[PDB]
From a paper:
JS003 is a humanized PD-L1 specific mAb which could block the binding of PD-L1 to PD-1 or CD80 and showed a binding affinity (KD) of 2.88 × 10−10 M in surface plasmon resonance (SPR) analysis. In summary, JS003 is a PD-L1 specific mAb with substantial tumor suppression efficacy. JS003 exhibited a dissociation rate 3.4-fold and 8.7-fold faster at pH 6.0 and pH 5.5 than that at pH 7.4, respectively. These results indicate that JS003 has high affinity to PD-L1 at the neutral pH but may rapidly dissociates with PD-L1 at lower pH in the endosome. Tumor suppression efficacy of PD-L1 specific mAbs relies on not only the blocking of PD-1/PD-L1 interaction to restore T cell reactivity, but also Fc-mediated tumor cell cytotoxity.
To elucidate the binding mechanisms of JS003 to PD-L1, the complex structure of JS003-Fab/PD-L1 was determined at a resolution of 2.0 Å. The structure analysis revealed that JS003 utilizes both of its heavy (H) and light (L) chain to interact with PD-L1. Of note, the binding of JS003 H chain is mainly attributed to HCDR2 that residues from HCDR2 (Y48, Y51, T52, S54, T55, and Y56) and frame region (K62) of JS003 H chain have formed hydrogen bond interactions with amino acids from C and C′ strands (Y56, E58, Q66, H69, and E71) and F strand (R113) of PD-L1. Additionally, Y92 and Y94 from LCDR3 have formed hydrogen bond interactions with I2, S117 and A121 of PD-L1. However, there is no histidine in the CDRs of JS003 that contacts PD-L1. The analysis revealed that the only histidine involved in the interaction between JS003 and PD-L1 is H69, which has formed multiple van der Waals interactions with amino acids from HCDR2 (Y56, S57, N58, L59 and K62). Moreover, H69 also formed a hydrogen bond interaction with Y56 of HCDR2. Therefore, we speculate that the interaction with H69 in PD-L1 is responsible for the pH-dependent binding properties of JS003. Rapid dissociation of JS003 with PD-L1 was observed in acidic conditions and structural analysis revealed that H69 of PD-L1 may have played a critical role.
Residue numbers in the entry:
A (entry chain M): 19 to 134
B (entry chain L): 23 to 234
C (entry chain H): 21 to 151, 157 to 237
The structure:
């Protein structure tokens, strides 16, 4: 079981919207009850998705109402995190954690343009 | 889940010899397997992780192996202190799962039990019940027969026994059998006897007393 | 580090089991704080964790009824299991792991939690004394509920020759165990032998000296 990231590094503009990608292999119909997905960065929980249901009560303050997972695309083996209105605090190492059968994690480094 | 099936459920090995404990995963885990040791009344103790490498302090004779779905813990030069339940864990995917465990017994030479009988206490008798206890101390193997006799009458259905886990120093068992009677039933007989049969005894031994 | 579980030993069916784990030492900064339980006659069942990020995981077998939380200001994390049944009688372990994909490598002692409608009842303690060169003494700890009961000898200074047997379930629904010690007969007139009995669920503490 290997989770794959198409991009090692995002460089984003201040105030933009971004969508970072995580691929994980699915075979032919997602078994939602077996899927576990966490998006975090380095003490902070962004997404908690365990055995088919989300729990945002775990989400950190920084990302409140701003970052969300896109659920229809889970069918495609795609776990995409969607960060709205990026700022310089969102810069940092992000990490995807996916368990479906086996489990793996990948890191992605993010840089945010100064204004202008 | 990934089911981890251990084999065997239990094994008996002599000292200085080798014991083999298998743990089989229901799907590829490739090497995310750990081994643990749990001595009686103690928390589990990590022995191996990544399926062949030892934790710090774990002696050399504990060796893990395998990859894919087949994993094996090998304990060489078996020591008395190695009595424990040994079990595996997979951390390849969630939820983490454990093998149900393998109980390792030490085989050793036969040891006859020392037998003791205890009358009921005057304090307990005041409460209306009499408990007669028979002790079988430091014997091997575990198989032992306790027969209660009361005025030469063979007792049935009125006794319970329990056995200690194998001792980690001398590899023996101990056994306690309790005969429970009403005060009334107790006062109506004289000779209370415990007859022990064990492969270490050339003939059954009987310890007894007389009420009063 | 060092993990210490706490909470009730008895919970009535359909209520919510609440437990607490007090985390000390190196384990304070370990990334994942887990809960594991062991139902009698069953393999270990992984319950879930809470992470240093505040994120939680719970086994799908239990997700509906389980809530894991933490309080870093006291160095604790908790487990709440609702609508408990007899299937939830288990020894509950708290335990740590370094990473998200690492073995559960440090375990607490674990605490037994029984689910039952029966009331707590403290035990009665009776001496075990005979009516050779080696003599046997003991204490009978009778008619208590629930498990466990702890017995030591001479406040923990005497461990050699001590056998504390597994508790036995009587037909009354109460438990009974005996703890014995073998000693030189040449010490009976000069050394004291005292069993220390503690039944925490009933807050019973008894020191009983047993003589010759």
């Amino acid at each position: 079981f290997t989770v794959t990231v198409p991009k090692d590094l995002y460089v984003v503009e201040y105030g933009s919207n971004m969508t970072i990608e995580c691929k994980f292999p699915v075979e032919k119909q997602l078994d939602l009850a077996a899927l576990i997905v966490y998006w975090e960065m380095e003490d902070k929980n962004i997404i908690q998705f365990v055995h088919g249901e989300e729990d945002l009560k775990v989400q950190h303050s920084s990302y409140r109402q701003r970052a969300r997972l896109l659920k229809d695309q889970l069918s495609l083996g795609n776990a995409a995190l969607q960060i709205t209105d990026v700022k310089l605090q969102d810069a940092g190492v992000y990490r995807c954690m996916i368990s479906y059968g086996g489990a793996d994690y990948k890191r992605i480094t993010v840089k945010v343009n100064a204004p202008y | 889940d990934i089911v981890m099936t251990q084999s065997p459920d239990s094994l008996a090995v002599s000292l200085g010899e080798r014991a083999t404990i298998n743990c089989k995963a229901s799907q590829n885990v490739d090497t995310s397997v750990a081994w643990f040791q749990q001595k009686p009344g103690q928390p589990p103790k990590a022995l191996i992780y990544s399926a062949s490498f030892r934790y710090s302090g774990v002696p050399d004779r504990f060796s893990g192996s395998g990859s894919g779905t087949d994993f094996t813990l090998t304990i060489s030069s078996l020591q008395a202190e190695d009595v424990a339940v040994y079990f595996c864990q997979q951390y390849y995917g969630y939820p983490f799962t454990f093998g149900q465990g393998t109980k390792l017994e030490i085989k050793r030479t036969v040891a006859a039990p020392s037998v003791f009988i205890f009358p009921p206490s005057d304090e307990q008798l005041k409460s209306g019940t009499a408990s007669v206890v028979c002790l079988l101390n430091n014997f091997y193997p575990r198989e032992a027969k306790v027969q209660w006799k009361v005025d030469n009458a063979l007792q049935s259905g009125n006794s319970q026994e329990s056995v200690t886990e194998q001792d980690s120093k001398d590899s023996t068992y101990s056994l306690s059998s309790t005969l429970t009677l009403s005060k009334a039933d107790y006062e109506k007989h004289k000779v209370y006897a415990c007859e022990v049969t064990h492969q270490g005894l050339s003939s059954p031994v009987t310890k007894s007393f007389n009420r009063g | 580090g060092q993990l210490q579980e706490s909470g009730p030993s008895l919970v009535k069916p359909s209520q919510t089991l609440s437990l607490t784990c007090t985390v000390s030492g190196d384990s304070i900064t370990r990334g994942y704080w887990n809960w594991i339980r062991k139902h009698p006659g069953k393999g270990l069942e992984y319950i879930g964790y809470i992470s240093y990020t505040g994120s939680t995981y719970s086994n799908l077998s239990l997700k509906s009824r389980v809530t894991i939380s933490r309080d870093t200001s006291k160095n604790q994390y908790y487990l709440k299991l609702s609508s408990v049944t007899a299937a939830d009688t288990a020894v509950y372990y708290c335990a740590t792991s370094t990473g998200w994909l690492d073995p559960v490598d440090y375990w607490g002692q674990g605490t037994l939690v029984t689910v039952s409608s029966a009331s707590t009842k403290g035990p009665s303690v009776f001496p075990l004394a005979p009516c050779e060169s080696t003599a046997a003494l003991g204490c009978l700890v009778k008619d208590y509920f629930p498990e466990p009961v702890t017995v030591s000898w001479n406040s923990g200074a005497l461990t050699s020759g001590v056998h504390t047997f597994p508790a036995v379930l009587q037909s009354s629904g109460l438990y009974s165990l005996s703890s014995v010690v073998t000693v030189p007969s040449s010490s009976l007139g000069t050394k004291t032998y005292t069993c220390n009995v503690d039944h925490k669920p009933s807050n019973t503490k008894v020191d009983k000296r047993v003589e010759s």
